[PDB]
């Protein structure tokens, strides 16, 4: 069902060259598969385990330990709004309410068209410019609930 692409295999092996032990490339191998396919499916655990020479239980433990390695299907874009305390003071709840009322989903859910998945993340290290959001790779700061219906429509 799952077979690693050639570019994924070369990227994983190149990451394995960087470390004394090949086990140390597990996080980056999972991130490589996730970057190529949106998330890490079930067969990717065994494929990465075979490439790295570690058990599949270790790969699954690493993949389910880290929050940013997705072991369930996500949408085309992952919205990650900050949940922590400075953005709580700066009013992240209005941003979360605006995102929920636009996308008609709860946090942790994906829209019916597969465009967005909404997730609360921890502090994005941008607390002096809060509240903060992270759509796929872009960090959007100084958020207002009125700017959500324009920010979300530039991610097709």
């Amino acid at each position: 069902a799952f077979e690693l692409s050639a570019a994924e295999r070369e990227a994983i092996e190149h990451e394995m060259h960087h470390y004394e032990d090949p086990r140390a490339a597990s996080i980056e191998a999972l991130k490589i598969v996730q970057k190529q396919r949106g998330w890490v499916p079930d067969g990717a655990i065994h494929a990465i385990a075979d490439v790295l020479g570690i058990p599949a239980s270790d790969v699954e433990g690493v993949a389910t330990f880290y929050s940013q390695i997705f072991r369930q299907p996500v949408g085309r874009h992952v919205i990650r709004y900050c949940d922590s305390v400075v953005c709580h003071i700066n009013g992240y709840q209005g941003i979360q309410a605006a995102l929920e009322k636009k996308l008609n989903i709860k946090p942790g859910q994906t829209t019916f068209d597969g465009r967005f998945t909404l997730l609360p993340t921890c502090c994005l290290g941008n607390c002096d410019k809060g509240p903060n959001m992270m759509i796929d790779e872009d960090t959007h700061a100084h958020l207002t609930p009125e700017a959500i219906p324009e920010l979300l429509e530039r991610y097709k």
């Binding site: 597990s26 996080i27 940013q68 305390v85 700066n90």
Partner: protein, 148 residues
């Protein structure tokens, strides 16, 4: 720095070999704890380790390992370019050198400024952060992040 000979093999003709990698994380707050950092570096779950042994004797892959913050290593080059006496003669406090300090959260100017140790929190909040915003009364503060 590698193309300029500052990294790699035979740095500045001294024979010292140093290779610098950038390992991007996958999002856990416990990964910053140094022994859990070492465990995540080794491709494991980021559980911390009991000390002793400290990572200086048995760290990453059982080798001598030193974990330091970004800002400590950024303090190092000024120390070695200007001297010990200069680093000890910029603040009359028991904590030597300068520190990045800053106020955040519903102040006029939330931000980050490099200040000597012994700078009071009031002068940071008023002179640098601009005081609290309009129509807001100061009721509490955390000095050093969410764990203080």
């Amino acid at each position: 720095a590698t193309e300029a000979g500052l990294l790699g093999k035979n740095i500045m003709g001294t024979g010292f070999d140093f290779e610098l990698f950038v390992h991007t994380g996958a999002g856990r707050y416990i990964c910053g704890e140094e022994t859990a950092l070492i465990n995540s570096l080794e491709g494991r779950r980021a559980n911390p380790r009991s000390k002793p042994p400290f990572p200086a004797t048995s760290g990453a892959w059982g080798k001598p390992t030193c974990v330091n913050n970004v800002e400590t290593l950024c303090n190092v080059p000024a120390i070695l370019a200007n001297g010990v006496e200069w680093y000890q003669n910029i603040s009359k406090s028991k904590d030597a050198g300068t520190k990045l300090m800053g106020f955040s959260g519903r102040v006029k100017n939330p931000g980050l400024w490099e200040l000597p140790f012994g700078t009071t929190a009031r002068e940071i909040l008023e002179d640098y952060a601009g005081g609290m915003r309009d129509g807001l009364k100061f009721k509490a503060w955390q000095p050093g992040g969410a764990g203080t």
